[PDB]
Design a protein around this ligand. Structure first.
Ligand SMILES: Nc1ncnc2c1ncn2[C@@H]1O[C@H](COP(=O)(O)O)[C@@H](O)[C@H]1O
Lengths: 492, 492
């Protein structure tokens, strides 16, 4: 998911729209934008589909005000295509709205706490609504008006003690301002920016990625620190505070692997550069370990893999050819009574340039291998195209565990790498040869861009969750959400 | 514009829908599909928008039949966005539908002929409607029913003798079958494919690009030769006949340069390979002419330019780096009361990776330059990013002339290279150095993939129109049309 928040001195709707357009790659399932108009009332518009689908002229009209936050969703367990999208909001205390990217590992607990102690009803399965409510109830502990920045930081701190997992949020509070905070572990991305209009009138902005600041002409100030809370008042003043106890930087290694746009700088690290380095490391490993076999060309599997494979091709000193072209326009498949000769699912996504495979032992490069069904077919497609030997190289290490901090992944039992050795996986997908990026390699490659970061969040590879609170009782609860999501979507 | 036609032994609506999505790059203004149902009646659905927007479940359900044609439009003169899209259909004689990619230079004269000799009214300005009525008019010369393949071909030849321009056409005549033909010069792209169901049944299909055959699992048969016609009966019989005098192969050069997909093989030439070749020619040329320039990095402008730039960087022995990222999703700007318009952005379509320009002399590579408006802003961005010297290389030569063969292009007036010298253009766009590919070189690059092609269609570069019927007078006519087009679109 991706979030944006702009506190400006002029109408923020188009900016929030444009900003979401460049964050669109973080979730195309749904989109929402909410602003505070001249009368101190929220103006909301959220629905499923791309940003362009969701917002029309009549919708932009009503999205009045000089401050608003936006969100683009990625379907997950607890928030399917059918569920209510973000941002959510409550009218008390004062009127709060919030959008978030990340996942609360103690969500269930919190829903219970909220009901028993605060009698606060959570109407959806979105942990975003829970988070908004915990935050809301904490602000309810201040009897006087208006609130002082500390109050808000107190609330935020309290919230950090109560919730667990990964999160990067932005929210607004009527009559006061806009706030944004990152989890104590700095797992989920969040950056701050500004844009001076004139003498003493700066507009501030926060977003999941730097590309949102760029596209709007905002000056990149810095990343929001782990456990830190930012608060911009309605008068344009920026305040900050450390709201966590033991803040640590354990950036999500996946953001760098393929989820984030390569022109983004996350925690002083360039996604593009990081990826190139991944090609260097993998290319070196391949030269070392696959010394004897004869590959004739390196072929990336769109999209992420392009620059990485190029680097590997360079290291291997072999030609790089664009063998697969991605079908940028994917249509809907209509269920019609007797779909005679259907189109191959894989071909729905990619197309193979026959000329690049004929009688060539090819080496395909992909950012990651999750299910393997896909992988198996891509390999199959290559053999169909005329490739003698088809070898696969993954830029990411074996994905063995599901992500519970913000990235939608299938259950541990669906991940083909879970409980399998490289050679088995190779046989299941039919690759003549398979090879993965070693985890420490991947780390060095990213860490090279910023040695200050000493540990990354990489549980999907090692099964080590920085928050420690992930268990099967919890993993199974996520599956209950997913099931209700599937019956809801199936119902539709 | 792109076209597709399938003569199948089972429903074709989803397949045609599938085909058009991989040809979506050929036109995104409007889409249309038309099938002949079990009752020998036309099933049509056509509207403005992408294929995935025009076709909803209820429409697909109506599109019943085992034979149909599809069309994705790119707005041109006469066929503005507000204009009725394709396919078009006449109820007589027999019932004919036609969809085409190209343009008729003698359209205006033909429209007059139709009215005076056949009292055939043309409701739109789309030359396709004229092409259809001409064809219809020719088929109206036959008494006996049904029509023998000979009558259809004779009719097609008669048509070829009256119309002039470039055109790849697909049409269906009720109770008979589908016919496809290519202009006598072989300008517009058209391929034939086949899919074998069993011993006694085969489905055939035609498309502007082979990528459409590829995706539907059709075996590539061959390109439809210039002046040739293809007839596929409702019973599955394929007929081919040469319907033009002195046909010659002059494939459109712009297809290979930018218009077509890299994974297509237009007239035996792989678009990808042609593109890579262009980078060799341009790299060598730069290495020769720009011998003393300090070029720190080769940065391609997405996306056509990527693989080309890669080649140039190899030739120059300079590092290739992704300094520009194309925002895959783009939205519309809104007309709201009171707000200020800031409708002047390439930043909406592109984002610059700052770190890749800082204190560097960059060589920006683009596929072509038309109005120069884009390139100016691209160069500006690169300067904003901190680049010292900004040089520009254009994969295509100077576009000084308007295209009148199916490819949309602004009037000569809006063409920056029209009436200007390289240096002059460089000054207008603010580049430190500007270099274009030599036309003869471009020809080598493409011709290298298929030496049998003597001459190509280069009018946009040299002003030589292979149909020998274009002159200032006619050019003015096309502009009066663009003025009518504007008004209809401004109106909506
Ligand atoms: N006829 C065309 N219509 C639209 N875009 C084009 C066309 N020819 C080239 N382009 C693209 O537009 C850029 C040139 O446009 P302009 O700056 O308007 O001259 C190139 O990078 C191409 O991607």
């Amino acid at each position: 998911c991706g979030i944006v928040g702009i506190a400006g001195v002029m109408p923020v709707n188009q900016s929030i729209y444009d900003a979401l357009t460049v964050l669109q790659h973080r979730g195309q399932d749904a989109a929402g934008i909410i602003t505070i108009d001249a009368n101190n009332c929220f103006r909301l518009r959220k629905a499923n589909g791309l940003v362009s689908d969701v917002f029309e002229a009549r919708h932009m009209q009503r999205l009045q005000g000089n401050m608003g936050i936006g969100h683009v969703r990625y379907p997950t367990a607890g928030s399917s295509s059918a569920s209510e999208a973000q941002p959510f909001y409550v009218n008390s205390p004062y009127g709060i709205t919030l959008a978030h990217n990340g996942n609360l590992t103690n969500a269930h607990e919190l829903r219970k706490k909220l009901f028993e102690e605060k009698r606060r009803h959570i109407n959806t399965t979105s942990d975003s609504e829970i988070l908004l409510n915990i935050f809301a109830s904490e602000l309810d502990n201040f009897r006087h008006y208006p609130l002082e920045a500390d109050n808000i930081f107190a609330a935020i701190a309290a919230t950090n003690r109560l919730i667990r997992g990964a999160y990067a949020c932005v929210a607004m509070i009527i009559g006061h301002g806009m706030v944004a905070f990152r989890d104590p572990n700095g797992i989920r991305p969040l950056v701050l920016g500004k844009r001076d209009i004139d003498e003493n009138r700066t507009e501030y902005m926060v977003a999941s990625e730097s590309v949102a600041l760029d596209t709007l002409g905002f000056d990149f100030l810095r990343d929001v620190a782990p456990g830190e809370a930012i608060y911009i008042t309605e008068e344009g003043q920026l305040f900050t505070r450390q709201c966590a106890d033991n803040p640590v930087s354990n950036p999500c290694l996946f953001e760098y692997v393929y989820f984030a746009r390569p022109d983004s700088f996350i925690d002083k690290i360039s996604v593009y550069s990081a990826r190139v380095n991944m090609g260097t490391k993998l290319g070196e490993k391949i030269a070392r370990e696959w010394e004897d076999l004869d590959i004739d060309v390196v072929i990336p599997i769109p999209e992420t893999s392009c620059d990485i494979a190029l680097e590997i091709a360079r290291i291997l000193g072999k030609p790089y050819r664009q063998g697969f072209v991605k079908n940028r326009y994917v249509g809907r498949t209509f269920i019609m009574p007797g779909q005679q000769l259907r189109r191959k699912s894989v071909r729905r996504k990619l197309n193979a340039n026959r000329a690049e495979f004929r009688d060539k032992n090819v080496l395909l490069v992909d950012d990651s291998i999750v299910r393997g069904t896909t992988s198996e077919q891509i390999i199959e497609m290559a053999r169909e195209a005329g490739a003698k030997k088809v070898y696969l190289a993954s830029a990411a290490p074996e994905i063995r565990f599901p992500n519970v901090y913000g990235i939608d992944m299938p259950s541990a039992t669906e991940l083909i790498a879970h409980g399998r050795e490289v050679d088995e996986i190779r046989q299941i997908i039919g690759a003549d040869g398979l090879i993965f990026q070693d985890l420490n390699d991947l780390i060095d490659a990213v860490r090279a861009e910023n040695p200050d970061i000493q540990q990354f969040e990489c549980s999907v590879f090692n099964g080590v969750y920085v928050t420690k609170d992930v268990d099967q009782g919890y993993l199974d609860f996520l599956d209950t959400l997913r099931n209700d999501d599937a019956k809801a979507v199936q119902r539709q």
